[PDB]
A paper describes a structure:
Pseudomonas aeruginosa CtpA is a carboxyl-terminal processing protease that partners with the outer membrane lipoprotein LbcA to degrade at least five cell wall-associated proteins, four of which are cell wall hydrolases. Instead, it requires the adaptor protein LbcA, the lipoprotein-binding partner of CtpA, for activity in vivo and in vitro. Therefore, it appears that LbcA interacts with CtpA to assemble an active proteolytic complex, which controls the activity of these enzymes by degrading them. We show that CtpA alone assembles as an inactive trimer of dimers and that LbcA is a right-handed spiral that might wrap around a substrate protein.
We were able to crystallize LbcA with its N-terminal 48 residues removed (ΔN48). The crystal structure was solved to 3.5-Å resolution by the SAD method with selenomethionine-derivatized LbcA(ΔN48) crystals. This structure contains only α-helices and connecting loops, with a total of 29 α-helices. We resolved all 11 predicted tetratricopeptide repeats, comprising 22 α-helices from helix 7 (H7) to H28. The 11 TPRs form a notched ring, with an outer diameter of about 6 nm and an inner diameter of about 3 nm. It is a right-handed spiral structure, because the first TPR is slightly above the ring, and the last TPR is below the ring. The first four α-helices at the N terminus form an elongated extension that partially caps the TPR ring. However, four LbcA(ΔN48) molecules formed an interlocked tetramer as a dimer of dimers in the crystal. The chamber of the TPR spiral of the first LbcA is occupied by the H1-H4 of a second LbcA molecule on the top and by the H2-H3 of a third LbcA molecule on the side. We suggest that this bundle may mimic a substrate and that the LbcA spiral may wrap around a substrate to target it to CtpA for degradation.
Residue numbers in the entry: 51 to 573
The structure:
Amino acid sequence: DSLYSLLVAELAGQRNRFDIALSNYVVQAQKTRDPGVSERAFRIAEYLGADQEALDTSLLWARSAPDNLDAQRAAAIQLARAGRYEESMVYMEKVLNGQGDTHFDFLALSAAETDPDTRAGLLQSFDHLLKKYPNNGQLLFGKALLLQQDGRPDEALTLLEDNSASRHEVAPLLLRSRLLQSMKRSDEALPLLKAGIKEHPDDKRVRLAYARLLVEQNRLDDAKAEFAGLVQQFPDDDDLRFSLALVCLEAQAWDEARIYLEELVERDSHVDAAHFNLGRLAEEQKDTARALDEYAQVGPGNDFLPAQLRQTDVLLKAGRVDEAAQRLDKARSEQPDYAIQLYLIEAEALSNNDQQEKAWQAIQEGLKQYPEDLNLLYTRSMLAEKRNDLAQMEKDLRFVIAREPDNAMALNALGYTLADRTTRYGEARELILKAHKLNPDDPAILDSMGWINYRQGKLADAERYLRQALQRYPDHEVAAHLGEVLWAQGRQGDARAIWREYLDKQPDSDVLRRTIKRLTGAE
């Protein structure tokens, strides 16, 4: 281990902080200006000058002052921080490629190991803090979080077992319980949670975790009593009541969940989410009328689109597609802010219930209404590709990649279709390279990279890229691609063995079945 070897982790930390700063700037730019007090005073002043028809000339003069202009201060701070981070990153990439006595300069190695942004430095700082203040509950909780996220949960649990504060403090106890539940030994977590209520009776999260652990076992009857006790001690907590309704709804005890949801309706808190969950429960109860009447009264927000999708799905289950289209059009006319998302809902529902022609017609209608929506024509591309229509699929995909030269996924999609179907191999290499440079973390882009490398002739690079893409996430398509690429280079047993796992007797593995027949056909 040397200093140059340690600098990469520092660069990774700088990358994380740069990403966070840039995303922070992005969310700042969209956000409206905070009320503050100057705009509040101007609001009361406008409320005053509104009484007389004569213009409040002094109010207009003051409200248009040069100091009343939004300079976007925090956004500029975030941008400048991201810029200096990028500058330092560039500097230390320039320092990395240099050669020298990287070793035996122990002064800088200590600073490289004390960096809180590196995982090893995080752990070193946590160890130094536990040395300074031992048995600190929050420090143990943070170190256990670090160890569990690092991919070593059992070591974190063993660290928790050695500390006595893990039995007393609420957050370490909660983390130890959810860790023990993942080790398939949930019963060991039962007594500790009880002891927590002995130490923290008024703490609602501890009792909620106790109730969830009761639900985990078959002994759910006491969990209903725990719900009743929580409601008895804190009948005003609306978020706690919503969480109790959610856990009761997970344990398919529909009666108490419906009771809690109607109680939330009476208290006028989380009304749209409450009605959405009532609609889901009624859909489970096969009560189509109640589910529809509850989905219709879901207000706009983070639950309007799921309610619309569930309504469309129930309508398609009933077979009255005309009423489904009419309700979706009426909802589009009611709230046109994300009407494009309503069209996406319609397309998804029609594609998931075997109405290919109606899905294509709805997408055509949506594009006629919004010809510039970049999601709508991409959905048209996927529908045309499912319809074996490569022409429309190429036209709109070229359209979207020309209008947005920096749309990775669409840029990726066409490229993959270039490698898999046609023989325009030169464009596909550049297309997949650009998609990989835009977002290397995307595993479908890595799959496309292995596929174009395999069809281009480079067998080793294709195998490595497909191996990486398969390591990130298990997919049947990537599995078949890796199997075929490995089979072509040789090592038949390895390709045969890789196929054994991801077959899994899956109806989704219908495409995978054809890869085996194509290659075992030569036998």
